[PDB]
Amino acid sequence: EAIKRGTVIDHIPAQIGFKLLSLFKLTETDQRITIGLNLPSGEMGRKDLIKIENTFLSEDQVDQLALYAPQATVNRIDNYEVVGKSRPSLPERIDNVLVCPNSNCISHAEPVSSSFAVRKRANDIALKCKYCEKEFSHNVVLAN
Template sequence: MTQDNKLQVEAIKRGTVIDHIPAQVGFKLLSLFRLTETDQRITIGLNLPSGELGRKDLIKIENTFLTDDQINQLAVYAPHATVNRIDDYNVVAKIAPTLPDRIDRVLTCPNSNCISRTEPVFSSFAVKQRQDELHLKCKYCEKEFAHSVVMAND
């Protein structure tokens, strides 16, 4: 909310709100997770003021609820995001994504020789936490990449 207590992005009656997305990541999430492949209304807030992040993105999708797998895969891109399930304009569940063991069908392997780039298979990466850095290991070529390398590839 702003100083005069007005919502900057309109409330939804029923659906999902993904909040606390790092600024400049909202559009990437829409694309990677194919969230726009629906006929439901989607409201996007970009570079909104945030006490915690300075600036944040926000996505609201009416009449759509993410699966637990989808929610947890968000942690790779937005580790501090919250996913709110809305019913009758009220938050009925507030979920913090947890880092999954695998992320499937979302990313592209940066290895140009990987079969996932040319064969009709879905991408699949094992998620590994190393000290303060996230690494992703491709199921097919078995190469491991820093999170930032895979993100820059998509």
């Protein structure tokens, strides 16, 4: 169910919508939000869907979605019309939302934002910690 002005994130995989809502604190706002989870989609099986009024995502904000919903589409909406359309591209760095798998990483106990360099690989994505300089499969970083 649509809106007048704002952003619509379409084609999010099942079980990722709520994850996105959590990681990116998207509901910490006063704006009207409309969410669909486990909606039917012949397009891809089944999908989650997020709609936020009067709110817009910079290219990089969109890019931050890439690790979780690579094939999502981000539509801009004004006067009920789709005005813009983009897709998430792998970013160079991912800040703030991952946590280092290294139990000894200085980044745990201290007042700094996590940060990783992002590097495309054959069968996974490599994440390198700004701080401890160790590199991990996104599978490891992302699974808990």
